[PDB]
Amino acid sequence: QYPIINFTTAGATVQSYTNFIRAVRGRLTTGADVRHEIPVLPNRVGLPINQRFILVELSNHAELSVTLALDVTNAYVVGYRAGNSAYFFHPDNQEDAEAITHLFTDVQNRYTFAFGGNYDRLEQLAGNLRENIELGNGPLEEAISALYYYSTGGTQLPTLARSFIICIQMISEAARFQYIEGEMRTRIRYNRRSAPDPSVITLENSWGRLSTAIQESNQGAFASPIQLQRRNGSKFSVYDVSILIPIIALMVYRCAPPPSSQF
Numbered sequence: 406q407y408p409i410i411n412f413t414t415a416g417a418t419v420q421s422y423t424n425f426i427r428a429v430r431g432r433l434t435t436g437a438d439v440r441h442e443i444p445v446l447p448n449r450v451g452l453p454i455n456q457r458f459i460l461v462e463l464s465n466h467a468e469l470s471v472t473l474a475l476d477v478t479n480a481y482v483v484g485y486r487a488g489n490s491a492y493f494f495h496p497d498n499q500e501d502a503e504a505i506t507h508l509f510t511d512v513q514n515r516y517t518f519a520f521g522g523n524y525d526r527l528e529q530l531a532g533n534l535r536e537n538i539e540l541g542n543g544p545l546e547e548a549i550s551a552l553y554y555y556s557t558g559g560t561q562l563p564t565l566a567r568s569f570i571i572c573i574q575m576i577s578e579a580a581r582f583q584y585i586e587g588e589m590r591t592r593i594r595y596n597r598r599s600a601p602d603p604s605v606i607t608l609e610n611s612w613g614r615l616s617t618a619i620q621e622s623n624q625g626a627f628a629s630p631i632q633l634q635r636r637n638g639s640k641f642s643v644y645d646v647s648i649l650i651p652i653i654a655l656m657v658y659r660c661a662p663p664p665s666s667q668f
């Protein structure tokens with residue numbers, strides 16, 4: 406019932422990845438909510454369960470497939486299916502716990518991890534921070550295989566956690582940020598894997614705050630500046646939505662939009 410978007414790492418190109426991310430964004434946002442040219446994801450409040458998730462089917466050169474489930478309100482990867490088994494992160498609340506019962510209902514084996522799916526928890530289990538985990542087509546190819554083989558005991562827990570970290574950034578973060586999509590496109594173009602630089606990390610860490618600042622802004626102007634980092638690690642101050650239009654593709658819902666004023 407939930408929409409499915411397919412991507413393969415097998416012979417992936419800039420164009421095939423671009424098509425994929427565009428399709429994910431199209432299934433995430435409805436077009437109902439666009440503020441300062443930036444789309445906002447659906448509000449969780451009153452969102453019907455039949456509209457709550459999208460499915461991302463990832464295939465690789467090794468001829469293996471896994472299906473990730475993403476919550477449309479935030480692009481959060483809630484879990485995955487590999488063949489006869491499905492695995493879900495420990496849900497953050499009762500609503501999200503109920504919601505995942507509507508996913509992969511035909512699967513033979515249903516598991517919920519005892520750990521949550523946020524970066525901090527996943528980094529702990531991986532034994533590595535995002536800053537030290539390589540991203541690119543190669544890492545994603547390998548991540549798909551690692552997720553696939555988890556149920557049979559072939560994949561160690563740090564490897565599984567690292568593989569989630571790769572998937573989340575290359576799918577969800579790329580969907581959220583044109584800038585991060587661009588960074589992944591570059592890695593694919595040259596087939597060169599590399600860990601995310603401070604510009605990528607700080608954007609990921611600031612998505613919620615940036616979304617709130619934009620939505621609470623006075624005609625686009627922030628009440629408080631937000632500090633980001635450049636590629637070299639130096640500080641970049643954000644005062645306004647304007648500079649973020651080429652950077653952020655989607656916002657999480659944070660508040661209602663204010664009415665315009667008649668002049």
Ligand SMILES: Nc1nc2nc(C(=O)N[C@H](C(=O)O)c3ccccc3)cnc2c(=O)[nH]1
Pocket residue numbers: 479480481482483494522523524525573577578609610611
């Ligand atoms: N499974 C999954 N996990 C995710 N985790 C993050 C993720 O941790 N993002 C933030 C960070 O690490 O700075 C964060 C978000 C909420 C509270 C504190 C920090 C961000 N996105 C995702 C995601 O899309 N899927």
Ligand SMILES: Nc1nc2nc(C(=O)N[C@H](C(=O)O)c3ccccc3)cnc2c(=O)[nH]1
Pocket residue numbers: 476478479481483494495496497498501521522523612613657
């Ligand atoms: N469906 C679902 N959603 C979850 N969401 C979060 C969680 O931290 N959600 C934040 C939010 O929705 O604003 C957030 C998400 C990604 C990046 C920054 C902030 C954390 N955990 C979950 C979860 O377990 N299930």
